Design a protein around this ligand. Structure first.
Ligand SMILES: CCCCCCCCCCCCCCCCCC(=O)OC[C@H](COP(=O)([O-])OCC(O)COP(=O)([O-])OC[C@@H](COC(=O)CCCCCCCCCCCCCCCCC)OC(=O)CCCCCCCCCCCCCCCCC)OC(=O)CCCCCCCCCCCCCCCCC
Ligand SMILES: CCCCCCCCCCCCCCCCCC(=O)OC[C@H](COP(=O)([O-])OCC(O)COP(=O)([O-])OC[C@@H](COC(=O)CCCCCCCCCCCCCCCCC)OC(=O)CCCCCCCCCCCCCCCCC)OC(=O)CCCCCCCCCCCCCCCCC
Ligand SMILES: CCCCCCCCCCCCCCCCCC(=O)OC[C@H](COP(=O)([O-])OCC(O)COP(=O)([O-])OC[C@@H](COC(=O)CCCCCCCCCCCCCCCCC)OC(=O)CCCCCCCCCCCCCCCCC)OC(=O)CCCCCCCCCCCCCCCCC
Ligand SMILES: CCCCCCCCCCCCCCCCCC(=O)OC[C@H](COP(=O)([O-])OCC(O)COP(=O)([O-])OC[C@@H](COC(=O)CCCCCCCCCCCCCCCCC)OC(=O)CCCCCCCCCCCCCCCCC)OC(=O)CCCCCCCCCCCCCCCCC
Ligand SMILES: CCCCCCCCCCCCCCCCCC(=O)OC[C@H](COP(=O)([O-])OCC(O)COP(=O)([O-])OC[C@@H](COC(=O)CCCCCCCCCCCCCCCCC)OC(=O)CCCCCCCCCCCCCCCCC)OC(=O)CCCCCCCCCCCCCCCCC
Ligand SMILES: CCCCCCCCCCCCCCCCCC(=O)OC[C@H](COP(=O)([O-])OCC(O)COP(=O)([O-])OC[C@@H](COC(=O)CCCCCCCCCCCCCCCCC)OC(=O)CCCCCCCCCCCCCCCCC)OC(=O)CCCCCCCCCCCCCCCCC
Ligand SMILES: CCCCCCCCCCCCO[C@@H]1O[C@H](CO)[C@@H](O[C@H]2O[C@H](CO)[C@@H](O)[C@H](O)[C@H]2O)[C@H](O)[C@H]1O
Lengths: 186, 69, 103, 486, 57, 100, 274, 66, 55
């Protein structure tokens, strides 16, 4: 819960002096981006799997049964008329995705149903929230660890910040080196 | 009236003609015309414009580098 | 609006009711074909049939399509007036500036 | 203060909290075990805009008639569920950090914010009454009038459009239900049932292998008779299907079900044949079930309730009226969609119905104590603790709201309830003067539920006839007489 | 002309004007709602429940 | 003048705001708030105060545009250059001769 | 320094001039309330009427107040404020633009996100193949190999959902620009004619006299100015609301006929059968 | 420029269907639920996924070795 | 930092004013206020009649 506080100033430094960015720093940032993007999908999966542990069979049939997945487009009377839709016709209208198949398997799985509301939703949001936050936190930690072992300007700035120094002092200390070694001061 | 993406229906379940009737031709001709049609008009126009500009894209920046020598 | 609206409505009705006519004509047996069995394993079909579901799934589908492909579509529209324009050579980074020994 | 007073018992409260959680788990295990084999599947349905679920008690509030449970045990179950809801601020340090203890201090300050474990009392009835009289009646007495205004202004509408929205036959009943705090006269519950005239006719389609059939009083009577005869299933199903085909023919002669010609609902006709698929004059394609002969008409076991609530439905209530309905009933309301508050209200409704069933099993209202009846009426939200009524008035109040909740409509229930929370304050000290008449007394006999009442015409209200004045009343009221004289 | 200017199109000064104006509006809403209508006076005075009694004889 | 009536010269001063310094102090306040409260990473405080900043910085640092925006790297007005034949070459040679 | 990014904003007379616009609302006390009541009840019937009504009232009265302050209380900003385009686009037009989206934003959002699932609307849709096409394929139309261009399709479909909310924006911008042009051009033309007359009379002092009268010309110009600007403000308000009706509020026409109830004192329930 | 509401269908034409509450008799379908040890393994897999993707912050890499 | 230069501090005197024309003064709308103050005062305070005796 401590790397983001340094990464703020490090990111400001990088945005200002982006000209001094190498290819490996770019790859580090791209890897953090990849982890951030996969964290969304992981959060969605965790939300589904958590909320499904507290959903009754009705809450699942709301998502499988085409009687419920057709409420926007189709009259309810088309389903009350027996023979209006045939068995194959009802079958093609069912969702085929992996969530629908997971729920279809989950019908015959024992779980702990709750009434449809805020607790059934929180039992998915909490695992999803923790997954998202923790994955992004560990991604930022990995980013800082990768920067510290990087022999570059940004690595030096990150190191100087991890010692416990102030942003302005570290910027000055690193720019004193940039002017001499990189730019070739007069 | 004459709303967008709207069509009335008669007792036979058929669309009533708002301006032009095209239900005299056989089913085969209609299927030939509509098998390749979609619910999208302007995107194909923008795509043809993009394909024209892609066929007529500029490659000077590659000439400067020597990719055509 | 334009006066061609009823023309477009007639053509839309044409394609819609002709597809419905074909679906009636071919009758049952569509589930036994390979097209259906492959569409069951096709994510495009999953997305398209999830869009029309209730429970905010229209918003989910629209926002997902945006976040995934609509950004590239915005870029594509921006790039239509860029393909024909004279642009300079790309100043590829020499990957020499930035390296600095640690101390 | 109360903060340190509750911190003193916070160590002694965790053991009781965990014990209560165990009791809740055991009771929920029993209840769900019964529900999973005796109760039907109430499918989830989305509102007209098809973005959020909608809930109604007719489908979702099931009553386990035959629950081997004491009434006090069910009170414990519900109260401990509410205590679990009240235990939620304990999560604040585990999401905000060590500085998330000031919310816990605010929680421990007021005893009304707390669960049962922080209470010194022992009996669930005394504990519930303490909580009510300390926090809950006061919290409810400041939402009642505003909720009443919202319900009124939901019926009559906004911006001077009453001539377009209100009905001229529910007018005097509307006045008696909503403006009887002006007159001081009692109210008849049937005049609140008259508010359902704003709605359409509630129907129930039984789904068969051929077509849906509308349920009627005759078909239901026949089915109850067959159920009471205790016949073999080979005879039971045969008689049921006979009554079903009879009702099918009856409705086909009536002109189809009521649902075919109602805006927002409808039964599709036979599908059309498009273009060359049309075989001359046969422009239609009947369904598969048309091949089945009508003598094989069998009930699928599936039912479709259609309340036809065009003005009363909880969807059109709004973001505010739902929250106030949940506030007035002392339910959770904050930071949730109207669907979740709808479910919470329907669950409260189900709890009250199950409690009514258990009370009727336990020997009616008269078997209850005075504090227990007071607490029941407080749960029903028809009494405030600053009244001190008689026993007969309480019994009549219970009977009134029990019949009103038997109809499964939250709007009229709230309209009835809010009338008992319209109290004024005088600017002078001498006024109101001390009364000369005795306290208000009633009896279960004074409540007319067994008779129908037509809506009084606008500006022509009629006086109230006692049920005893009706012919053969001593025969109809004989049950209440036997219960009261004993 | 002076008002024909792109500087005056997104003028932050007019935005401050609008901001302060509508914040003050919000502050004073509960005083704008403080007008009395005499409709419930009418309802109290004119609503008269049937005061006749029942007499079988 | 009429245009003088269509003018707003009721100005008072120029408000100067160093948005860089203000952003720096805002970030410092966020860090101080998150450290003093000892808030964890899964908190809504930490999320609201860290995630969007980190996301935008990562987006602005990952960006590798082959070309700069429209009116900065192309589509620019440029005076026509002198050709190596015809009249321009003759003028160039005449300039070289006259100067020397 | 490098990190210092400096911005120059500015600032003038805002506080005391904006305070009195609100303080005057207690004096006017929403005199326009009846007109907007009439028009809103003409154009829409819903529970959320009062909401939109209040919005318009506030907006309208502010406009009216500014106009009178622009005509009478001539100090500082009150003169320019009607001659500025930012006031007419953001100070009058944006609020009226976002008012229905703030009152009926739920329904409009649901409608817009449903129209991204573009489909042909059939009246008396008793068809069966329509349902299968709408669910299986997603639309009535043929969506075969449109995913191939999904990147554009999405954004194009987004416009396809809001295209019937766009003329409201156009009319708002158009009438804001119209009011700006009207005020500016008429003030400039009137002042120009006045200045030409003063040039004619200053060079001929036989005419440099109060030739029409001290109050006659002034009274006439007062009446002309107030009549013209009141007509223009009435035009702006009335046309803005008529276009609100014709552009945004016809979506919300849902007439429900009254169906008589019969089963008042008895309701069928799950326990009646099960 | 742009379309109007008069040139389009209403929010009542779209979304015209009011609500109907379906109920179904209990034959015993939600009984004898198997996979009693499913959620234990799911939580184990979740914690495993979180552990493999875990990265502790190691500031000792910034130690002044030079 | 904040500033308050001396360039804004300049001499002031009403003698150096160019002034207004008769036309511009009429456009200042003072002659309208002059009439309509009395008009509205008269309308308000004459709408409310007191009791009297007809002679
Ligand atoms: C092929 C190309 C793609 C085609 C389109 C997508 C197809 C998927 C789909 O959507 O079909 C429908 C299909 C639904 O199936 P169904 O059976 O028809 O529906 C059953 C019920 O109806 C379902 O009922 P339910 O309510 O219980 O379901 C819950 C609901 C989900 O529960 C929810 O309600 C949450 C809704 C989330 C909404 C979306 C987020 C929006 C955020 C706000 C947006 C604001 C607007 C921003 C735009 C700018 C605004 C100005 O389900 C969904 O809606 C599916 C969402 C799919 C996940 C998308 C997550 C997107 C996050 C956005 C960031 C993406 C970054 C890029 C990722 C990497 C790209 C490669 O969706 C899925 O089942 C997919 C879910 C599983 C995802 C797994 C993806 C694979 C990941 C593998 C591991 C990691 C990668 C490993 C490496 C792989 C090699 C590279
Ligand atoms: C910004 C996010 C940051 C997140 C970061 C990480 C967060 C971690 C901590 C956060 C924890 C949750 C907070 C998330 C925020 C959202 C909150 C929210 O939406 O919930 C509102 C939610 C609103 O109520 P509702 O959704 O209308 O509930 C309707 C009923 O379920 C009526 O339906 P019913 O008919 O099914 O009633 C059943 C009845 C009883 O149900 C049962 O007895 C069995 C139900 C099956 C089990 C369901 C699992 C429940 C999981 C909840 C945690 C269980 C432990 C609870 C006890 C811990 C404290 C002693 O009630 C319950 O189910 C209550 C649950 C506990 C029952 C005991 C289960 C055995 C343990 C070899 O408030 C609650 O009801 C929460 C009650 C639980 C409070 C416990 C707090 C624990 C504090 C930490 C202790 C150390
Ligand atoms: C920042 C990045 C952070 C990343 C975090 C990701 C990881 C953390 C958590 C992981 C996510 C887990 C998945 C999840 O949470 O699913 C949530 C949620 C629930 O999924 P579900 O459980 O499958 O729902 C099933 C049924 O809805 C179940 O029905 P129900 O009865 O249980 O509850 C139904 C209720 C949902 O109940 C709740 O969830 C309560 C929410 C409060 C508790 C928090 O309604 C909805 O379903 C919402 C659908 C949204 C469309 C409805 C229309 C919304 C109108 C919004 C106002 C008007 C907009 C402006 C108008 C002006 C423009 C014309 O999925 C979502 O759709 C999320 C959408 C959230 C954004 C909505 C914003 C709308 C306004 C956008 C304006 C335009 C800008 C955008 C372009
Ligand atoms: C998202 C929502 C999804 C589920 C919605 C259900 C729900 O949240 O129930 C809340 C629930 C609302 O009450 P209710 O469910 O309607 O039932 C009320 C009862 O009937 C009793 O009714 P009552 O009339 O007797 O009133 C009880 C009284 C006393 O209530 C108490 O029990 C004690 C007060 C506890 C205050 C906890 C809030 C602390 C706020 C942070 C303060 C700084 C922390 C330290 C520095 C860092 O209520 C209050 O005075 C204030 C309650 C509301 C406080 C705000 C709770 C935030 C919920 C987060 C979701 C909404 C933001 C999005 O709040 C509570 O009453 C218990 C405290 C909940 C603690 C939850 C901890 C997780 C907070 C996550 C923060 C998310 C922030 C995201 C935006 C930034
Ligand atoms: C400015 C005027 C005041 C601002 C108040 C706004 C309230 C915010 C809020 O409650 O959000 C939840 C609220 C819904 O919450 P809810 O579920 O109905 O429950 C109401 C609260 O629980 C009712 O509050 P409560 O009775 O539970 O009391 C607790 C509350 C009370 O404390 C406060 O909220 C504020 C504290 C200062 C006042 C303390 C005086 C005592 O403090 C809290 O703990 C939660 C507040 C966060 O959101 C809204 O209703 C929308 C209003 C805000 C949107 C307006 C448009 C925003 C501008 C759009 C910009 C972009 C357009 C393009
Ligand atoms: C903060 C606390 C957050 C916790 C949730 C808040 C309380 C729970 C709640 O709001 O229910 C969810 C609400 C359900 O409302 P409902 O209870 O079902 O009431 C429906 C009744 O029929 C409605 O009954 P009603 O008529 O009495 O109430 C109507 C109310 C309904 O509105 C509401 O629902 C307000 C609810 C309060 C929300 C709190 C906002 C606080 C903001 C501060 C996390 C999201 C991450 C993703 C973000 C990016 C999308 O007002 C409206 O209809 C207008 C809403 C829109 C106002 C803002 C419009 C700005 C216009 C800007 C101009 C645009 C011009 C461009 C045009 C383009 C060309 C067309 O649905 C949602 O908003 C989406 C659910 C998921 C996200 C919710 C939180 C974020 C979005 C809000
Ligand atoms: C029904 C009538 C139809 C015929 C319409 C004729 C057009 C009338 C236009 C009226 C609007 C003109 O608006 C009016 O313009 C004048 C002239 O600048 C402004 O007048 C102001 O600026 C002028 C410019 O020199 C100064 O000289 C004058 O002292 C000052 O009052 C008013 O403050 C403004 O209210």
């Amino acid at each position: 819960t401590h790397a983001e506080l340094h990464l703020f100033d490090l990111d400001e430094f990088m945005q200002t002096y982006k000209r001094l960015q190498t290819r490996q720093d770019w790859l580090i940032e791209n890897k953090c981006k990849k982890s951030r993007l996969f964290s969304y999908v992981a959060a969605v999966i965790a939300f589904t799997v958590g909320k499904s542990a507290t959903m009754s069979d009705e809450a699942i049939l709301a998502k499988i049964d085409p009687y419920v997945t057709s409420e926007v487009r189709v009259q309810r009377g088309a389903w009350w008329r027996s023979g209006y839709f045939t068995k194959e016709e009802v079958e093609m209208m069912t969702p085929k995705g992996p969530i629908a198949r997971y729920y279809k398997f989950l019908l015959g799985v024992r779980r702990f149903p709750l009434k449809h509301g805020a607790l059934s939703w929180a039992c998915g949001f909490v695992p999803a929230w923790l997954t998202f936050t923790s994955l992004n936190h560990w991604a930022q930690n990995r980013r800082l660890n990768r920067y510290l072992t990087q022999e570059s300007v940004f690595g030096e700035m990150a190191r100087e910040l991890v010692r416990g120094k102030t942003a302005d002092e570290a910027t000055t200390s690193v720019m004193a080196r940039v002017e001499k070694e990189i730019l070739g001061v007069h | 009236g004459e709303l967008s993406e709207y069509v009335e229906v008669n007792e036979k379940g058929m669309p009533k003609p708002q301006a032009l009737s095209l239900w005299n031709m056989p089913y085969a001709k209609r299927r030939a015309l509509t098998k390749f049609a979609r619910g999208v008009r302007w995107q194909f126009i923008v795509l043809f414009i993009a394909l024209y500009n892609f066929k007529n894209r500029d490659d000077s920046h590659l000439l400067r580098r020597g990719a055509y020598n | 609006s334009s006066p061609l609206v009823p023309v477009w409505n007639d053509l839309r009705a044409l394609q819609v009711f002709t597809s419905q006519e074909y679906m009636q004509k071919r009758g049952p047996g569509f589930t036994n074909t390979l097209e259906y069995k492959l569409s069951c394993l096709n994510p495009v079909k999953w997305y398209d049939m999830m869009k029309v579901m209730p429970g905010g799934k229209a918003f989910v589908g629209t926002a997902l399509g945006l976040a995934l492909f609509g950004g590239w579509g915005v870029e594509f529209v921006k790039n239509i007036s860029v393909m024909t324009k004279e642009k300079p050579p790309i100043d590829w980074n020499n990957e020499k500036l930035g390296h600095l020994t640690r101390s | 203060t109360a903060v340190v007073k509750n911190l003193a018992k916070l160590p002694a409260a965790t053991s009781q909290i965990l014990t209560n959680v165990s009791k809740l788990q055991t009771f929920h295990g029993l209840l769900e075990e019964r529900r999973d084999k005796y109760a039907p599947l109430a499918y989830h349905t989305y509102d007209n805009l098809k973005q959020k679920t909608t809930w109604h008690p007719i489908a979702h509030a099931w009553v386990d008639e035959g629950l081997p449970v004491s009434k006090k045990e069910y009170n414990e179950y519900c109260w401990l569920k509410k205590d679990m809801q009240r235990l939620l601020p304990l999560a604040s340090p585990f999401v905000f950090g060590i500085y998330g203890i000031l919310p816990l201090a605010v929680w421990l300050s007021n005893d009304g914010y707390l669960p049962s474990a922080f209470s010194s009392k022992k009996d669930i009835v005394s504990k519930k009454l303490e909580w009510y009289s300390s926090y809950g009646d006061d919290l409810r007495q400041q939402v009642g009038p505003m909720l009443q205004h919202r319900l009124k202004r939901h019926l009559r509408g906004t911006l001077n459009n009453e001539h377009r929205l209100m009905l001229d036959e529910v007018t005097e009943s509307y006045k008696e239900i909503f403006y009887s705090h002006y007159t001081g006269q009692l109210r008849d519950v049937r005049k609140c049932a008259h508010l359902r005239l704003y709605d359409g006719t509630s129907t129930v389609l039984l789904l068969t292998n051929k077509e849906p059939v509308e349920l009627t009083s005759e078909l239901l009577q026949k089915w109850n008779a067959i159920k009471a005869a205790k016949l073999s299933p080979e005879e039971e199903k045969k008689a049921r299907n006979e009554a079903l085909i009879e009702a099918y023919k009856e409705q086909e002669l009536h002109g189809g079900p009521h649902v075919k010609h109602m805006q927002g609902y409808g039964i599709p006709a036979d599908t059309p044949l498009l273009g060359e698929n049309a075989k001359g004059d046969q422009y239609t394609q009947p369904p598969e079930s048309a091949s089945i002969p009508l003598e094989q008409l069998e009930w699928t076991g599936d039912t479709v309730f259609i309340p036809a609530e065009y003005r009363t439905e909880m969807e059109d209530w709004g973001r505010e009226l739902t929250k106030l309905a949940n506030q007035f009933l002392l339910l959770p309301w904050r930071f949730v969609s109207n669907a979740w508050n709808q479910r919470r209200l329907v669950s409260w409704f189900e709890e009250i119905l199950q409690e009514d069933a258990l009370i009727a099993k336990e020997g009616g209202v008269q078997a209850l104590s005075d504090d227990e009846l007071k607490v029941a009426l407080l749960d029903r939200a028809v009494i405030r603790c600053d009244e001190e009524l008689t026993r007969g008035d309480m019994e009549a109040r219970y009977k009134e709201i029990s019949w009103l909740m038997s109809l499964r409509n939250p709007f009229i229930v709230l309209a009835w309830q809010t009338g008992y929370y319209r109290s004024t304050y005088s600017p002078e000290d001498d006024l109101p003067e001390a009364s000369i008449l005795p306290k208000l007394n009633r009896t279960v006999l004074d409540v007319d539920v067994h008779n129908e009442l037509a809506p009084d015409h606008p500006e022509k209200p009629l006086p109230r006839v006692h049920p005893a004045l009706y012919p053969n009343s001593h025969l109809a009221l004989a049950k209440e007489v036997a219960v009261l004289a004993k | 002309l002076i008002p024909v200017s792109l500087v005056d199109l997104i003028n932050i000064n007019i935005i401050f004007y609008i901001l302060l104006l509508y914040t003050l509006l919000l502050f004073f809403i509960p005083l704008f709602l403080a007008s009395i209508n005499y409709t419930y006076h009418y309802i109290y005075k004119y609503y008269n429940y049937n005061y006749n009694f029942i007499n079988n004889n | 003048s009429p245009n003088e009536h269509l003018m707003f010269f009721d100005f008072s001063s120029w408000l100067l705001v160093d948005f860089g310094k203000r952003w720096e102090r805002w970030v410092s306040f966020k860090k101080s708030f998150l450290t003093t409260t000892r808030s964890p990473y899964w908190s809504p405080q930490f999320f609201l105060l860290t995630f969007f900043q980190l996301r935008n910085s990562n987006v602005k640092l990952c960006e590798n545009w082959n070309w700069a925006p429209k009116g900065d790297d192309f589509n620019l007005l440029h005076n026509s250059a002198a050709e190596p034949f015809g009249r321009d070459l003759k003028a160039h040679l005449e300039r070289e001769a006259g100067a020397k | 320094m490098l990190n210092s990014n400096i911005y120059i904003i500015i600032y003038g007379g805002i506080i005391m001039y904006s305070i009195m616009i609100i303080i005057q609302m207690f004096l006017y006390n929403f005199s326009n309330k009846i007109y907007i009541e009439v028009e809103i009840n003409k154009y829409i019937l819903s529970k959320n009427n009062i909401d939109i009504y209040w919005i318009i009232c506030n907006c309208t009265i502010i406009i009216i107040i500014t106009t009178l302050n622009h005509i009478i209380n001539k100090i500082g900003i009150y003169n320019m404020i009607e001659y500025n385009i930012c006031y007419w686009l953001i100070g009058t037009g944006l609020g009226l633009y976002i008012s229905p989206f703030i009152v009926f934003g739920y329904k409009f959002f649901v409608y817009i996100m449903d129209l991204n699932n573009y489909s042909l609307n059939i009246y008396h849709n008793n068809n069966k193949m329509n349902d299968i096409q709408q669910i299986y394929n997603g639309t009535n139309y043929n969506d075969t190999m449109i995913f191939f261009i999904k990147d554009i399709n999405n954004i194009f479909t987004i416009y396809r959902s809001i295209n019937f909310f766009m003329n409201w924006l156009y009319q708002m911008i158009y009438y804001g620009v119209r009011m700006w042009l009207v005020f500016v051009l008429h003030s400039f033309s009137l002042g120009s004619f006045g200045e030409l007359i003063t040039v004619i009379t200053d060079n001929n002092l036989i005419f440099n006299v109060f030739y029409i009268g001290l109050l006659g010309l002034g009274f006439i110009l007062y009446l002309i100015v107030i009549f013209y600007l009141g007509i223009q403000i009435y035009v702006y308000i009335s046309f803005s609301l008529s276009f609100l009706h014709s552009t945004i509020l016809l979506f919300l026409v849902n007439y429900i006929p009254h169906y008589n109830n019969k089963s008042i004192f008895n309701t069928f329930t799950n326990k009646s059968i099960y | 420029m742009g379309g109007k509401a008069s040139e389009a269908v209403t929010i009542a034409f779209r979304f015209p269907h009011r609500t109907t509450f379906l109920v179904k008799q209990n034959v015993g379908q939600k009984l004898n639920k198997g996979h009693q040890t499913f959620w234990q393994l799911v939580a184990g897999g979740w914690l495993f996924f979180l552990l493999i993707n875990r990265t502790s912050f190691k500031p000792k890499l910034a130690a002044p070795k030079v | 930092p904040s500033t308050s230069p001396a360039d804004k501090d300049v001499p002031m005197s009403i003698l150096h004013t160019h002034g207004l024309s008769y036309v511009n003064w009429c456009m200042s709308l003072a002659p309208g206020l002059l009439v309509f103050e009395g008009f509205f005062r008269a309308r308000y305070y004459r709408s409310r009649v007191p009791p009297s005796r007809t002679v």
